[PDB]
């Protein structure tokens, strides 16, 4: 099953789930970031 | 066998109408069988023009609608002449030698369509505006 | 006045002539 | 002279593996034209890995 | 007889590591990138790689269990989001003013403006699924009952998921257990359809009818006793429809007339909810049960009596039709696709019948007044049903390519349709062009007559009338059956044919939908666009094996792009490509059906009723003189009613406006795949694999363009996804704002 | 020769077969011996029954005779099918096998028609053969 | 003032974008109970606009006639936070994704079956490549200077000319 | 009719010949070795231009090439 997790769709989804949820948490605590202050 | 055999195929109540229409009839000449086709087709072609036209409550709706009907016969006289020049280039022979297979009398068919067509258009004009 | 005569000529009559002229020209042969 | 198992590069311009590296499967020991059978790691559009070439279309990159 | 194999497939993760483990071709590894698309294409086509019909049928059996699991997962989330994230409790106190809402949206970047002012003390997305009116008809008054139904759906999802593992890996049936069609017909008719409508009638009598008569009297949803308290307290159930003090002794002594207060034939709409009477539906499903229970005692089994379906096809043959149905039973007990085609035909045809019978006879309380719900319930099941009809012509064509046999089909009814398929198609060819001219050209005439200043020369009600007299007569014989031909009915089958107006609150629940010249025009558009959809799909089914162009079309398969550029060009000859062409024509057929629906209801049916009895409709009866022209279909329907989907930015309707433009994008993105071809993009990629070879990192999986058959599929997917979601967004943001 | 007439199989059908092209120019006939009485699909629709025969079937195209001839060698293993093209209203008798041996098999006595003594990359430019009667692919 | 743009702290139109936004929500708060759950949902929504506008005044953005913040990309160092500072922030992350997958495919191709290792991701080899991807502006410079960043045009597959 | 040319890279695999739906191609004795076989196109007047032959050729870039030319009743694949 850990060999199955290295296959491209499931390893391509959970990092797409991770890279999304990074930006979801960043925009949650730090809202409305147009520019670098 | 090549052709399919349905129970309603090759029925004499249907095949008998074919052999006695003026397109397959044995005794008719091309001047006669074009006169009969034109007299039937010109008679009903003035039907749709006089009650479905751009002017229907007029003096006027029956005369102008019948003028459009002979307008189609003289158009279809040209198409019957155009089909004759194309499909009979020197009246190209074939195996059967009917009027429609090789032409050989085709100029009498197109003229007979014009007389019976424009006549029965005008004949049905007499039965609606008068009679 | 001349509009009433000419626009059914090149609208109806003249296209009927050139279509008749082109159709016999297509289906001729040597 | 190219032997079997040697790495070549293809000079045939119409080939899929033109200017690419392949290894020879075998050489036919007769006078048949295009005897050099090269096997490639990349597949072409017909999904085949082998082709026949002549000696003038292969080199000795080694 | 039951014969089961014990442990044919082990439960390991060894084949989870290998993608494409099931076929000889895909279990070699990817040399190109078409292997990725070839992998997902034929996974669930079990007939291709496994050539053992016993092995295919077990794969199909466990797959339906797994599909039954994901519907129960969807059913739990339909109930859990009804319990936790909904205003269902305040909605039962006021079903007219408070809009049905679920799906609270998280407080992030600005999509918490979608949580709109929907009613009471709640903020969420107004739902158009009808779940609030369905749970009110089921009797649910608290979210505790919605909670256990979400738990009860999850354990049913795990039970179906356990049954799918068990019936393939552990205890797999043989082939002869699947071919017992007469026992399977007996069991689904009696058990699945009979007892399913018997026991739901048991729910409707004991649970639905007690709490809904107390809702129509309107005490409170909290003052209403619990549904199990109508079973214990027999004096409480005797207070409303007092025939429960006599018990089941009227049932067993055949004195069924004593049940004439909760098993009625009232036949109409409730004046206080605008739905069907639940006493009618309780008497309905009981009669549906007894009709279905005895229908499961029809076919023969291992106890001698009954009909055998093989002997009903033998000796059903005439002099016109040769051998008749001789051989059809050997087709339907061996061809999984011929089963799938006919099952998809009447499951999709039924779904349009569901949609047509639910706006005219609204079954749920406060469904007809919710214009936001009844329109989307129509447009859902029409779209869902028409997709399955294309799958009927799809899988009928796969029957001809691989499951057809010349030896078994000799002079039967399959063969005799294959011998006059030019007579069927060319007569279908004529009737499409006949209906295309004589329905659509009557708009082109009406566009031209309206433009040229001649409104007396078009087809209208103040013009040359084309009246629907064959439908207005059926409007007369069905509206005059209360007391005449259905004598025990108090009112008609619906108020659509004729009758009074029913007004719940201030809005029309149902009113007579009058038909005219404009209704004659669209109904022949529908019959035209349906007949072309038959014309493409039947041409793919009949010419699936051969034609005059390609006589060995069955040797190339059901799914191939072409047979070359020769014979003039043979592109899209396959039976697959007729399904691909029929998907657009299904899109064209169904989208004008719902444009007919969404304008006929808003103009002639739906609207507000004043206290005096006068009706003021939504768009103001502009279907009669507007829908006769294409311009009026553009100006007064597509331009005027799309004013709420484009002015939706800055409100709770904004995501429909984002989906409106979001689907205009993907629809146009589809034409990149439809109008183009593969050999352009393969050489465009050849310069892009060059720049990845230039910096020395090109992938060993060689980048390939999509196939011709796949680029047709990628285009037809985004065309439908971009086309329907445009209509999804336009319909939703309109009727939420106006109804 | 063609052995016309020969018994047409017991079929009775097919709207989709042998229309007016056949009587004016160039229809085709395939003649085989079926060593059973089995049912077989046609290029037009599907059944007839194969006779013992001397079986004969008149088809519209040479394409349909090889597409039927591939079926008799695949399903029924009768490889003695003999396609033809008719007399006066047709063109050339005995289309296949032209040398008596199936074309996938080599036979001495045949000549290489349409051969090019080069590769396709050695084909000249179309600008080199501009305004000439020579063709870019012909040798 | 680089294109006729007053700053947003002095823009009278940018203040009126604040005034109608909180008026559309205080009118949306007028119908609810003061202690309810949609009451604190709109009060947290109003305070998100107050943290939106007071962030944009002090950031030194340029508001036009409509009253919206504009970005000035000619890059000046007084306006470097609009495009120049997030531009260098993008290119490192994008080059980290680029140099990882490029070095991953070079490590995979010199193996037995390189084609399966594009399906399955070798977690040792992938984590070896993200170590080589953090140093991409230093690693690509020595890869280019040593000459193994590019191939010659006689080693690449090339169409007939 | 269409023109079908056979180039000297043919390996006598017979795949093209066995792909043709109208029997346009056949194998003939080669004189370059008197051992192998090359494809030939003696009946190009029956070629419909389907290109099934080329799709069966194994050699990396075709040994048999079909260049679509003047169309005829036979080449257009008409039953009429
Ligand atoms: C392709 C063009 C493009 C560009 C240049 C941007 C840029 C931005 N968007 Mg926009 N946006 C886009 C497309 C784009 N987006 C699309 C297609 C949508 C619809 C889905 C949106 C919908 C949208 C919303 C609703 C919001 C933004 C916001 C933003 C800002 C990010 C603020 C932040 O906190 O991130 C900083 C991120 C980091 C410091 C981490 C970056 C590293 C990540 C994790 C790597 C991911 C790699 C995979 C930034 C200016 C937000 C904003 O504040 O607007 C003013 C915001 O609320 N965008
Ligand atoms: C949980 C324990 C378990 C394990 C270890 C296995 C293992 C196996 N199964 Mg079995 N099976 C199981 C449970 C299990 N199964 C269940 C619960 C069912 C009922 C669905 C089945 C029904 C079944 C059938 C019919 C077949 C197998 C087969 C197999 C073998 C290969 C399958 C494979 O590798 O693809 C792994 C597949 C996946 C990882 C994908 C799972 C797909 C799920 C079920 C549905 C996904 C839909 C989901 C909603 C996504 C939609 C999109 C989304 C964005 C919404 C493998 C030995 C095959 C076989 O033995 O061939 C010889 C075979 O034909 N299984
Ligand atoms: C029918 C399928 C289905 C769909 C499309 C959704 C969709 C949603 N759920 Mg629901 N839910 C479902 C079934 C479904 N649910 C079932 C079966 C249960 C019982 C287990 C729940 C129990 C549940 C709770 C308790 C909550 C949601 C929430 C949500 C929303 C946020 C997405 C999320 O949290 O994922 C997170 C992403 C991942 C887990 C990635 C993997 C989203 C609208 C949240 C919500 O609506 O907030 C207001 C929320 O709090 N769901
Ligand atoms: C493609 C997937 C799909 C989805 C997501 C939906 C979604 C929905 N359906 Mg629909 N449905 C579909 C396909 C789909 N439908 C098809 C193809 C049909 C035709 C069979 C139906 C028939 C249908 C009916 C009759 C009803 C719904 C209703 C609903 C809504 C409520 C959900 C619910 O649980 O009701 C649960 C379902 C019911 C309460 C009614 C079930 C009664 C039917 C007659 C049982 C038939 C079962 C039987 C096995 C199927 C016939 C087999 C036969 C051909 C041999 C929801 C919007 C309900 C609604 O409108 O809500 C307001 C509703 O009353 N659907
Ligand atoms: C009388 C008891 C009974 C009941 C309630 C059912 C009910 C069902 N069967 Mg049936 N089935 C039965 C007896 C029964 N079956 C018998 C005796 C046989 C063998 C002759 C079958 C052979 C069978 C097959 C092959 C399939 C079903 C399927 C189904 C499901 C249809 C999907 C749906 O509408 O929900 C439904 C749950 C379908 C299913 O979902 O399989 C899991 C399906 O594919 N059944
Ligand atoms: C098929 C599902 C179903 C089920 C499980 C029940 C179950 C029940 N019924 Mg109901 N009932 C049903 C359908 C059903 N009914 C139908 C179709 C009718 C119309 C004929 C009725 C009309 C009815 C009456 C009038 C009464 C019951 C009563 C009962 C209860 C006691 C009867 C008994 O135990 O024997 C029991 C809970 C008795 C009861 O206790 O009601 C609360 C009772 O008085 N039933
Ligand atoms: C709006 C664009 C459009 C139009 C007008 C058509 C039209 C047609 N399609 Mg096509 N189709 C389309 C888009 C369109 N399609 C697209 C996008 C696809 C890709 C999926 C297809 C795929 C498709 C398939 C698969 C099929 C069709 C078929 C048809 C024909 C159906 C029969 C009919 O109604 O004849 C009557 C013609 C009309 C109603 C067109 C309007 C004519 C007006 C009203 C009369 C003309 C006025 C005047 C006399 C014109 C000339 C004046 C001048 C000479 C002076 C019809 C010609 C079918 C067919 O051919 O069946 C026989 C068929 O099977 N189409
Ligand atoms: C329509 C009336 C009709 O179906 O007639 C009924 C007739 C079939 O009648 P028979 O009694 O021959 O049919 C016996 C079985 O075929 C049906 O059980 O159908 C045909 O002749 C073919 C229909 C072609 C219809 C062409 C239109
Ligand atoms: C319903 C029906 C039917 C019928 C229909 C039809 C077929 C009709 C038509 C009819 C027609 C369509 C008729 C025709 C008629 C004709 C006529 C009536 C004509 C006449 C004419 C005339 C008389 C003229 C003369 C003339 C001339 C020629 C020239 C000189 C002068 C004149 C003018 C004198 C049928 C049987 C199918 C079947 C069943 C159903
Ligand atoms: C500053 C600035 C600006 C400007 C800009 C410009 C003008 C630029 C240009 C640029 C350019 C003109 C460039 C060029 C380039 C070229 C080349 C030649 C390149 C190459 C590259 C490479 C080779 C890559 C590699 C890599 C890496 C590094 C990593 C990842 C992977 C890869 C492989 C991708 C602006 C105004 C906007 C704004 C402000 C600031
Ligand atoms: C655009 C187009 C292409 C090119 C399109 C292709 C090749 C699709 C490739 C795009 C996808 C999105 C590439 C996906 C690459 C990886 C899977 C991305 C993974 C990223 C992870 C983080 C998930 C065709 O091949 C084609 C073929 C036939 C008719 C029309 C067309 C056509 O229109
Ligand atoms: S041309 Fe192609 S298919 Fe024909 S023999 Fe030569 S290599 Fe084989
Ligand atoms: S193009 Fe088709 S018919 Fe012509 S030789 Fe090639 S395969 Fe045979």
Numbering used by the authors:
A (entry chain J): 3 to 39
B (entry chain L): 15 to 145
C (entry chain I): 4 to 33
D (entry chain E): 1 to 62
E (entry chain A): 14 to 752
F (entry chain D): 78 to 216
G (entry chain F): 26 to 186
H (entry chain C): 2 to 81
Published text:
Photosystem I (PSI) is one of the two photosystems functioning in light-energy harvesting, transfer, and electron transfer in photosynthesis. Cyanophora paradoxa (hereafter referred to as Cyanophora) is a glaucophyte alga that is thought to be an ancient eukaryotic alga evolved from prokaryotes, because it has a characteristic chloroplast termed cyanelle. We present a 3.8-Å resolution cryo-electron microscopic structure of tetrameric PSI isolated from the glaucophyte alga Cyanophora paradoxa, which reveals differences with PSI from other organisms in subunit composition and organization. The structure of a PSI-monomer unit within the tetramer is similar to that in the cyanobacterial and plant PSI cores, except that the cyanobacterial PSI contains an additional subunit PsaX that is lacking in the Cyanophora PSI, whereas the higher plant PSI has additional PsaG and PsaH subunits but without PsaM.
The final cryo-EM density maps of wild-type PSI monomer1 and monomer2 were obtained with a C1 symmetry at resolutions of 3.3 Å and 3.2 Å, respectively. The subunit composition of monomer2 is comparable to that of monomer1 except that PsaK is lacking. Monomer1 has 84 Chls a, 19 β-carotenes, 3 [4Fe-4S] clusters, two phylloquinones, and three lipid molecules, whereas monomer2 possesses 81 Chls a, 19 β-carotenes, 3 [4Fe-4S] clusters, 2 phylloquinones, and 3 lipid molecules. Some of the Chls are lost from PsaB, which is likely due to the disordered structure around PsaB and/or dissociation of the cofactors during the preparation of the Cyanophora PSI cores. Examination of the subunits in the tetramer exhibits that PsaK is present in monomer1 and monomer1′ but absent in both monomer2 and monomer2′. On the other hand, at the edge of the tetramer, PsaK of one monomer (monomer2/2′) is too close to PsaL from the adjacent monomer (monomer1/1′), leading to the loss of PsaK, which occurs in monomer2 and monomer2′. One interface between monomer1 and monomer2 of the Cyanophora PSI tetramer is formed between PsaA/K of monomer1 and PsaA/L of monomer2 at the center of the tetramer and between PsaL of monomer1 and PsaA of monomer2 at the edge of the tetramer. In conclusion, this study has demonstrated that the eukaryotic PSI from Cyanophora can form a tetrameric structure that is remarkably different from the Anabaena PSI tetramer. This seems to be caused by both the absence of PsaK in two of the four monomers and the unique structure of PsaL.
